[PDB]
Amino acid sequence: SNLIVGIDFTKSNEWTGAKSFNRKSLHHLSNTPNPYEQAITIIGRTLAAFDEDNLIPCYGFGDASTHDQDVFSFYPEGRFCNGFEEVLARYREIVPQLKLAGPTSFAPIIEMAMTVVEQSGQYHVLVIIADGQVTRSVDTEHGRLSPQEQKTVDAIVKASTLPLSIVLVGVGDGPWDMMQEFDDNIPARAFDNFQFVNFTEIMSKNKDQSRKETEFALSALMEIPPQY
């Protein structure tokens, strides 16, 4: 198995840390690791074993350079991060230059993972670290969903015929209704290829750190098919 990492850089990260991060942006850099740093770090400690070559494709999405249309690679060319040590380091280099934007769709990151799978038909797990706030639609002229939620669901459906599992690592306050829906209720799906894990909730419990980290890791891999 190999890992793929996508990181949400949309503007909603500015306010989804109201309760869980003392009204600082989830991407704020300072004396203490923000929830994205914490997740990258713990993923490195607990899930990195499930990447066979320890090379990690990392992508960002939803900043002003990509909006809801594209992703960007952490490194020029098709060059990958060497371990989650470098994932974290590169995140910290990149964050100060980014203008957080939107709208929010998972279509571009899921399409990028589909391309990674075809560059390999080997099994992959895509890990998206995100605040859960995909663009919502209040409008009957739009149709049922926002175009972002429609495109995202369509990408999740298209990916479900590939050897790919998706894991949403949720950081911040939520709400988590949309992620829980992607987790449990996408009907046109070939198989259940989306798992939601509430990282911020798990890490806030009164248990030993190492037990919290293990609870996170197993919750993350809980829907990975039997055959692995």
- Residue 85: which of Ca ion, its own copies, none does it interact with, CB under 5 to 8 A by kind? none
Q: How far is the CB of 11 from its own copies (least distance, A)?
A: 34
- Residue 217: which of Ca ion, its own copies, none does it interact with, CB under 5 to 8 A by kind? its own copies
d(CA 190, CA 187): 8
Kindly provide the residue ranges of all beta strands, DSSP E only, lying in 77-206, ordered along the sequence: 81-82, 124-130, 164-170, 194-198
Closest by CA to 3, choosing from 50, 68, 73, 69, is 50
Among 14, 154, 183, 201, binds Ca ion (CB under 5 A): 183
Element (H, E) at 6: strand 2-8
Q: Is 180 in the site for its own copies (CB under 8 A)?
A: no
- Residue 226: which of its own copies, Ca ion, none does it interact with, CB under 5 to 8 A by kind? its own copies
Number of residues that bind its own copies (CB under 8 A): 21
Q: Which of residues 11-50 bind its own copies (CB under 8 A)?
A: 45-50
d(CA 65, CA 151): 19
- Residue 46: which of Ca ion, its own copies, none does it interact with, CB under 5 to 8 A by kind? its own copies
Among 53, 139, 177, 208, binds Ca ion (CB under 5 A): 53
Tokens encoding 82: 């060497």
Instruction: State the burial class of residue 123 (Cβ atoms within 10 Å of its Cβ: 0-12, 13-18, 19+).
Output: middle
- Residue 55: which of Ca ion, its own copies, none does it interact with, CB under 5 to 8 A by kind? Ca ion
Q: How far is the CB of 161 from Ca ion (least distance, A)?
A: 16
Instruction: State the burial class of residue 157 (Cβ atoms within 10 Å of its Cβ: 0-12, 13-18, 19+).
Output: middle
Applying CB under 5 A, which part among 91-99, 145-153, 165-173, 194-202 lies near Ca ion? 194-202
d(CA 33, CA 92): 10
Distance (Å) of CA 13 to CA 97, 104, 111? 15, 11, 22
Q: Which of residues 199-228 bind its own copies (CB under 8 A)?
A: 207-208, 210-212, 214-215, 217-218, 221-222, 224, 226, 228
CB 151 within 8 A of CB 29: no
What are the residues binding its own copies (CB under 8 A)? 45-50, 54, 207-208, 210-212, 214-215, 217-218, 221-222, 224, 226, 228
What are the residues binding Ca ion (CB under 5 A)? 2, 10, 12, 51, 53, 55, 104, 133, 183, 192, 195
